[PDB]
Amino acid sequence: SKAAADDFKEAFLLFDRTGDAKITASQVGDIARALGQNPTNAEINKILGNPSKEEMNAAAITFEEFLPMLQAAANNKDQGTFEDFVEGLRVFDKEGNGTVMGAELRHVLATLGEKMTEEEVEELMKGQEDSNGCINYEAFVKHIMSV
Amino acid sequence: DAEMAAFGEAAPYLRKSEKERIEAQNKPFDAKSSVFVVHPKQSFVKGTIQSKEGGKVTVKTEGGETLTVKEDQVFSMNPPKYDKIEDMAMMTHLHEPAVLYNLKERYAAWMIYTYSGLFCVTVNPYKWLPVYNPKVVLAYRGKKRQEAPPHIFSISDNAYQFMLTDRENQSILITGESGAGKTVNTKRVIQYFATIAA
Amino acid sequence: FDETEIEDFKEAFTVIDQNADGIIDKDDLRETFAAMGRLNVKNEELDAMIKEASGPINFTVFLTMFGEKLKGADPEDVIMGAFKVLDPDGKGSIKKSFLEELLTTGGGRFTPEEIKNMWAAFPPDVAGNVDYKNICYVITHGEDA
Amino acid sequence: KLLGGGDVDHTQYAFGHTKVFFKAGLLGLLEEMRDDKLAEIITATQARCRGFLMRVEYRAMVERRESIFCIQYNVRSFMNVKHWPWMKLFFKIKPLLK
Predict the structure, then answer these.
(1) Is C43 labelled a binding residue?
(2) Percentage helix, strand, coil for chain A under 3-state DSSP, each rounded to 5
(3) Which of A64, B23, C55, D40 holds its CA 20 to 30 A away from the CA of D16?
(4) Secondary-structure percent of chain B, ordered helix, strand, coil, rounded to 5
(5) What's the gap in Å between the CA of B140 and the closest CA on chain D?
(6) SS3 of residue D10 by DSSP
(7) In what order do the strands lie in the sheet with B44-52?
(8) In chain D, which among 15-74 make CB contacts under 8 A with chain C?
(9) What residues of chain D lie within 8 A of the CB of C35, using their CB?
């Protein structure tokens, strides 16, 4: 709305590697996340196809399509409730203390639903899981929602 | 394969080669179309669903026949993963036909012992088999029924086991029609006891 | 330029300036080469070294000429710093294909053709990216050790 | 052990000596609804992660910024120099020093 945030246009100049002021359709998922929006990858996929837009063939972009797609994704930020994120992992391990065994969270984050690479899974556990093999998800989900 | 040695010679009548298996479980399957069906002459034969009359069904056959039968004259067919299942009760398709069919298939392959829950189904070979084989007897000795293929000594040994493990008495109930050949089993069970604990 | 590297260039300037007056002339170049074993050092080689300067080779003219040729010169401890960050678990020399991919995909200075020239005198291990350390030696002091 | 993972009803099944038991078709229905509900819950929780994941990549890319250059230029020197009389000289000579 501007509140006209012109820093979204300045961040589009940091993600366009050619400097022509266009951003390919394959970068739009990760740049919506870098502007403070977390649409799921199936949602980013649907919307695209919904608009008869094929992410399979070469794509370019213009700021005039990327701005309204970020504004259509911005209504879905009401789905980001931290009660359900901590209660999900509290149902994932027994006893009254928030600890996932290391390999349980790593294999679930790579193979269940939207596949996260094991390189990204190791980069998200690095520091929050110590050598006991127990990830405290009270501080883990706190630090994941700090970015 | 590796396991089977004890039997070795009996093996083929107890279990199938690890690829015979593999070649059977890992094969093409079309669930939505493949089915079992009622049949005026033969009880239940298999077929492929052709069309759908809204509550009637037309099916091809395995022999080549086409019948339009009710919706409930039609029964699903287990994925190939359940070919000659040791325990039909593990099937995800608890029908009338699937049971008939499982027994039948593992018989045409000369396997007379197939389990159906707790039961130990036994089919009359009508010929001779290395099953009562003096090697087998040992083989089945000290083995839970999950450590070995479907067989009567399984039942018979487990009883024994269980006997000493739980400190409870046991029983074996053999039953069938006039020609089913129970005496034969009964006797055979008996020898078993006598041997393994004399 | 760290100060010990500038003191190393001051010591090399004093070993080539055998008249000890502070300016390396063509006679100093020829008499330093003859004391290293070069009896056949041509006058055209001495003239090509003097043709790289606009004036007499005093200590600050020798430092500015070496500065302008060594604008990306890195000491061995900072090259081993960067190679310890590339092998963050320590000890192991890093893979050949990992250094080829990371040179190209990060920067234009790491483009392939240049990577074939890196493997070409920096031998296999060095080229490959497995050993490590011998390349830091020959980048601070050239030629085979 | 496998069933350890999944955002699945750990109820709906049951194990035993030769096999697992599983519901469909109601409990089957339940789960399904549930399934969708995690995509939500999940899909949203994935994103941030994804987001966040790359957000750390930028902090690294950036750090790296110069250490490369240093490495970049530094090599180039050598490739040029190593063939220079004066530099070879310094080289054989660099040792006699103290």
Answers:
(1) no
(2) 50, 5, 45
(3) B23
(4) 30, 15, 55
(5) 18
(6) coil
(7) B67-70, B56-59, B44-52, B34-38, B74-76
(8) 64, 67-68, 70-74
(9) none
Q: Is B63 left (phi over 0), alpha (psi -120 to 50) or beta?
A: left
Distance CA A115, CA A137 (A): 20
Q: Which residues contact C64 (CB under 8 A, 6 or more apart)?
A: none
Q: Are A113 and D46 in contact (CB < 8 Å)?
A: yes
In chain D, residues with a C-beta closer than 8 Å to the C-beta of A70 are none
Token reading at B110: 């000369």
**Among candidate residues B84, B102, B120, B61, the one with its CA nearest the CA of residue B12:** B84
Q: In angstroms, what separates the C-alpha of C91 from chain D's closest C-alpha? A: 20
Q: Which residues of B are documented as binding site for ATP?
A: 176-183
Give chain A's length.
Answer: 147
Closest CA to D17 of A127, B72, B147: B147
Whether D70 sits inside 8 A of C36 (CB atoms) is no
Residues 6+ apart with CB under 8 A from D26: none
Residue A91's identity, in one-letter code, is V
